[PDB]
Amino acid sequence: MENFQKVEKIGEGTYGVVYKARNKLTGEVVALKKIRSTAIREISLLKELNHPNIVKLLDVIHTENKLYLVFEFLHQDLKKFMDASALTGIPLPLIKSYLFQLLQGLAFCHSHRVLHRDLKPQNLLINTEGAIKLADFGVVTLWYRAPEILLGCKYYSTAVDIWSLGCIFAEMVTRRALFPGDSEIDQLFRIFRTLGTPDEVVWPGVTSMPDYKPSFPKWARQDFSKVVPPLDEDGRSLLSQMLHYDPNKRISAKAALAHPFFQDVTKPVPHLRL
Template sequence: MLTVSSDTLSQNANKLDKFIKLRKAGEGTYGVVYKAKDKITGKFVALKKMKLDRYENRDSEGIPSTAIREICLLKDLHHSSIVELLDIICGDQKSIYLIFEYLELDLKNYLDLSKERLPEDLIKSYVKQLFEGLAYLHSHRILHRDLKPQNILIDKEGHIKLADFGLSRCFMVPIRAYTHEVVTLWYRAPELLLGSKMYGPGVDVWSLACIMAEMITKKAIFTGDSEIDQVYKMFKICGTPNESTWPGCTSLPDYRSSFPKWEPQDLSDHIDFHTPQQKDFLLSILEYNPAKRFTAREALKTDYLKHTKLTSPELQSFEGFSQN
């Protein structure tokens, strides 16, 4: 049974009084996020109010196991590319407040607000930081399982961080069965789309590959409006997988012999790459076969990311956002 110590969950609801809520910064299935200010330090924080009555398997009293799982994961994560959990405060019986470090924008907002194409050095800087965070997660046997631009935060100095661990799970070796109904559709790995319940860190790498493609083009590469449409959008560009390109794929629960047989297209027909090296790197992580797909650590060892430096984003987008 999952438990959280009294040191971790403060019973003093008055601790909330030290924060001034400035505006709503976002809202998800299980909570609302506010930009807030610490009255004592003057620092901005992100205050996430978790609505416990929205969680499944909740007892009439106490904290549901799904909420505890997320908190337990977050409180043990300490990495420069992962948003930091600063404090946990119990509100009333229906809510818990998670206090996070504050970053100005999520990646989706930044891509929408940016007027110009993102330069390659910024993309490389972002991709390297994200893979560093992912390598840290995977080394601690944690799958994020919901990587998308909305769950990635950035600041004015060029830092980028993984956030929103509501669907994250610990994994063991050998991999055991998990639900395949995770990850937002446009960023869902092919093994998940084809119904595999035995999957590993590669699902996060595929999501990050889709995010990298979106950084280059400023639009999502696979935009299905249903699971089968997502599969077809993916197959039309990357080709319909078979036993020679992805051994074992035809045995996956949702693979159909009736799938149309598309040949893989040149990715350059869909993405205007900055350099051939950028294309080669993306192909190594946008790989159907999870066994051949680069791991986060392998991606970090490539020449493409090896000498990448921190790069600041276009500040005009931040200024436009702060005025909203």
């Protein structure tokens, strides 16, 4: 650890604190995450999970009851970029590029049986080159939580990452969070109010979930044309498939990459003021 000079705190978190730091020897600038035997083994599995859309884990330093994760440094995250593009909105071809890249990242993880589990704009990092990458592989924000997690499914699938990414896609488009819940039930009920209270028709097995209550109010569903205007039909079609209640019907990352929405995908560069 002494092998690094701290430059500035870049953020806190549930797990640990994140610093911008400099390798005292190499000069390399990195993000250094400080963590307050099976965790060590799953961490070391992460070191092999290399992809251009996954923040590169450079090193894992286990010392004196402290754990340091050394990551490649990126200058900006999607949360701040959204905030900064608020007045004008992220241009659609850039939204589409970011979505496509994240779908590639997810198709990679998922094929290796790795789930992210906690996707959110704050953990999506961006560079000047137009690249976007997944970070922080798993108050706590519930806004991107899939409904099967909220309903108490213990053994949820890669589908939960697709739900979170749908939520982020919608938010880039509208410049407002899709389901800004401030408690588990508020999060659940905000989802129901927009997508309709789920039942056995749309999600077989739903009424048998651990936290499902027959007393849930019964809201009718709303049309996507109301949800994410002025996203085109291809985009609204893809979003509706990323937000299917049933995790088994929800589109996979790999099938999403084939959706017609991406027929004209390109890689624009964002304008970033560092």
